[PDB]
Amino acid sequence: GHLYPGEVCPGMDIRNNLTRLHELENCSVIEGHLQILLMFKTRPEDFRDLSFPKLIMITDYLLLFRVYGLESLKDLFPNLTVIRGSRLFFNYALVIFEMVHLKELGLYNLMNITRGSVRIEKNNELCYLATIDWSRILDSVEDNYIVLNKDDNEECGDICPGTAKGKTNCPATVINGQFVERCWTHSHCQKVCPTICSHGCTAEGLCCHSECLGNCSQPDDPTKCVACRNFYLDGRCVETCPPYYHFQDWRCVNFSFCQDLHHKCKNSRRQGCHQYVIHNNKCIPECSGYTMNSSNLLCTPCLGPCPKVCHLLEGEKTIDSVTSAQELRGCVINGSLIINIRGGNNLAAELEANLGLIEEISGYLKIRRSYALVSLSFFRKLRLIRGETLEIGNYSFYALDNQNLRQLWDWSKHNLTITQGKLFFHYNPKLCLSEIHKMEEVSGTKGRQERNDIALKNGDQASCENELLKFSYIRTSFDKILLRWEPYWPPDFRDLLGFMLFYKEAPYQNVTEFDGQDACGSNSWTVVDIDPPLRSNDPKSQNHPGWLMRGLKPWTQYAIFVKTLVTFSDERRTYGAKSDIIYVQTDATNPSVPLDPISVSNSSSQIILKWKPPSDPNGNITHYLVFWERQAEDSELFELDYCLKGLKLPSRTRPFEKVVNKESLVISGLRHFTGYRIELQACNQPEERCAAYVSARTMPEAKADDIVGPVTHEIFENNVVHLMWQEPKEPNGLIVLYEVSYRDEELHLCVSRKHFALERGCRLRGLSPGNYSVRIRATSLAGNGSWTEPTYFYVTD
């Protein structure tokens, strides 16, 4: 036909040389698996001129293992499109294992894997794996398992064509934050269908017919598909089989077809054939409840029970994968089942679909090392474990080291019964003893000798608390919490060993409840052990228990749930009690001192000051206050005369109001050669439930003083020349000196700081006739300039 041109052939196994590989030449669909492996002495040249373009689908799975020599599948299966995964190879529908010389994966026409996962592993030279978007290929992307390929290290490089060359024509794809174009080889880019279309798409992106799967030659045609969703019939894909019967869940067949299979299997007891029968408009190899079949191929409902018992080879079956589980579809088990599902991936859905119909087990049930097996509920209809064959020690149920086993059954809904054997439970961390005791009750074991081997101290690292504790009273200091939960005792208060109170810092109302974990201080609850309350008489007299936790940081939030501690015993119950996860926060208190007071002479008007928040605000830091004290100048500075021998030349180096979150401040108005005491504090709150210290000078005069004044002379007589000077007031006025020169290189004099002020005192004396000059250095603390004009006069003595 126009959809599938070639034949359909059963599963193949190509081994030890590629000579037998001449079977895929004419097949388009394989009703089985395709295994190509163990052909060491083959070389790439052998695969240089071998291809299989007509193959388009593999129903079960594809496996390749140590096929030496071939470098890529891009020339071997150019047209493979769909792997339905009806029967899987250990959860996997595509497997590539230890392909020594394989370099890139090819298979650019693969566009849907209906069931199972993919496992490409230990290919020492394989790359072009990160360049594949599995989310589009598998309708579910998790559970994939690709590791130890060359791409994992060695910085293997892949070069997707088109988009990287500016030619586009290579779809970009999604990564959590690093979108990238994706491809199978350096010359084949993966197809991506527009979301509106699992159905196929054309070259330009038009949607194919709703029944087509993967690809189609022209859009919106029931025919011309490449692969069919649901069922295929004579060149078109149909939603369901028209009256023809469904066969192998992928195609339609007539009555004669199934009749031939029935006759052939009857005529040949090959142990590879099935007495195919018809049932519920389907052609199937084994039709419970309809076991009998007449001379027709149609099975009919039974009169009386007809369970379709399933007999186990050697009497023990290990359910280690979906492949093992799937082998029991539709099954009463005439043996014992061992469940050994390792690995982190969870497959409870598949187990229920395959094993959910089992109603009884003849032998024992053993569950060992099942890691990600959360619950046994997937045995949706198991109701009897006869125990005719027992695990050594006479155990009927045997659970050991189930890291995540949590619930056996919904005992409110379920029923169970075991006619013999004991019960064994060991090292199951998260299985609470309450469930085990319920099973003891609802399994008939309590109805006889009992003496089951339930290892107390199961349930560790899990919370099995079945009662509440209520905080009857609380107090909130800024460093302490009073806490008084209501009293509680088991039926016999001697079982009460005390209270264990848990707490940690929790700045948010969302926190995970206790589950049983370590005690490292980085994240774990801090635990304080509390002795039991006194037992005197009825509660009306006996006070409630309580605690006083102490040493807390103020104003922060904590979760302070409490739980009881009791002695364990098979004889006794009331496994414990646990309060809620209530939040409380200690009261706030006055903040700490502000940090890092800094000063700078930025602007001549005022000091500019910066600070840092208090080390511990002890509250929601909201408010700051600053004092700027305008200190007066020191005492001796107004009178001390520095003209004295040895005495050095001197040098130096309410308006208050609060401030908003801004952590810097500037003020208006100040002197020059100035800068004074600052003290400031912070507030987390008119109550003013709130000083750091810093003193700093600011700019000097910031201009040149060079103060003008009565610089003129007046010659009354020799030594009476009447030279005067006036006080500088704009700066702080702490005049260090006035330079007096009698210019002979300006022979100089110093001026007394206040004897001059008495009445122009300390004037120069004893002048000679002729020109004389002077420029007065009315010197401030800095005194960089301060010189007047070098005025000169002709002395006439």
Binding site: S477, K480, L482, D531, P545, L548, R550
Partner: protein, 34 residues
């Protein structure tokens, strides 16, 4: 020290009103109330 007075005041509250017991030893609320 002063912590003893501060804490014990908390316990008594409105009610009106040892070092060998709650300083040189571990102390619990059940005893302070006495």
């Amino acid at each position: 020290g002063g912590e003893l007075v501060d804490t014990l005041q908390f316990v008594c509250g409105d009610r009106g009103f040892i070092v060998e017991e709650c300083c040189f030893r571990s102390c619990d609320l059940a005893l302070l109330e006495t």
